């Protein structure tokens, strides 16, 4: 069992079958070698940040991304989010625009750092958890999808309502995993400029809060702090 450092216990327990799998041993050897030959994002200590900031027991919302940002300083282990001081990437700018129209009083901050969402139960999961600098999809099919489907399954296995937000054709394929009787799927086009017309006006943030309120699960406070510290 190859267990990463500083993971919540409930994740260690739920994901032990993955951490013990032969394919995961192989993935570990591949990434060791990858980090010698290339710059790999995010840095090793950040790869599991989504699970650390949002323990399994605290999951209320799951927002699935594809893989990490692959430019310098961008990815830090959360879907969609970037480190403080980094330019807000296009998809996140569109997310901010939809937030501004969906959530009364929401003001988009200067930064793209979404840690405060993760700290209130929003699991910001990428399907693939590492990438070579500058090459998108470069770690596709190496085991991360198996691993993150196991995360999705463990979340779906909870009895208390979780809202799964599935943006775009790739994330929407996960809908078949969401069989839990209390869960809710919110689905639309991706916020990327390529498909933003199928994202704008879908109000996924108020809809998620309505579902949470109804279940007595506590609506998310979507407003981000105006300035941040790592």
């Amino acid at each position: 069992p190859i267990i990463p450092a500083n993971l919540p216990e409930d994740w260690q327990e739920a994901l032990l079958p993955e951490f013990s799998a032969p394919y995961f041993h192989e993935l570990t050897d591949f990434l060791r070698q990858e980090r010698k030959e290339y710059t790999i994002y995010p840095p090793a200590p950040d790869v599991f940040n989504a699970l650390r900031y949002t323990p399994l027991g605290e999951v209320k919302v799951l927002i699935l991304g594809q893989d990490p940002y692959h430019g310098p300083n961008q990815a830090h282990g959360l879907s969609f989010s970037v480190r403080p001081g980094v330019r807000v990437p296009p998809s996140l700018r569109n997310i901010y625009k939809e937030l501004t129209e969906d959530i009364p009083g929401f003001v988009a901050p200067k930064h793209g750092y979404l840690r405060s969402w993760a700290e209130q139960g929003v699991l910001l999961l990428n399907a693939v958890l590492t990438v070579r600098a500058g090459q998108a999809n470069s770690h596709q099919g190496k085991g991360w999808e198996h691993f993150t489907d196991a995360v999705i399954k463990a979340v779906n296995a909870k009895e208390e309502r979780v809202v799964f937000i599935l943006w775009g054709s790739y994330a929407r394929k996960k809908k078949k995993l969401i069989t839990g009787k209390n869960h809710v799927v919110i689905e639309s086009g991706h916020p990327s400029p390529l498909s933003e017309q199928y994202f704008f006006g879908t109000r996924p943030f108020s809809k998620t809060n309505e579902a949470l309120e109804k279940a007595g699960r506590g609506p998310v406070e979507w407003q981000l702090p105006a300035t941040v510290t790592e």
């Binding site: 190859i2 090793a44 790869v47």
Partner: peptide, 4 residues
């Protein structure tokens, strides 16, 4: 040692 670990790459994650």
């Amino acid at each position: 040692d670990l790459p994650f």
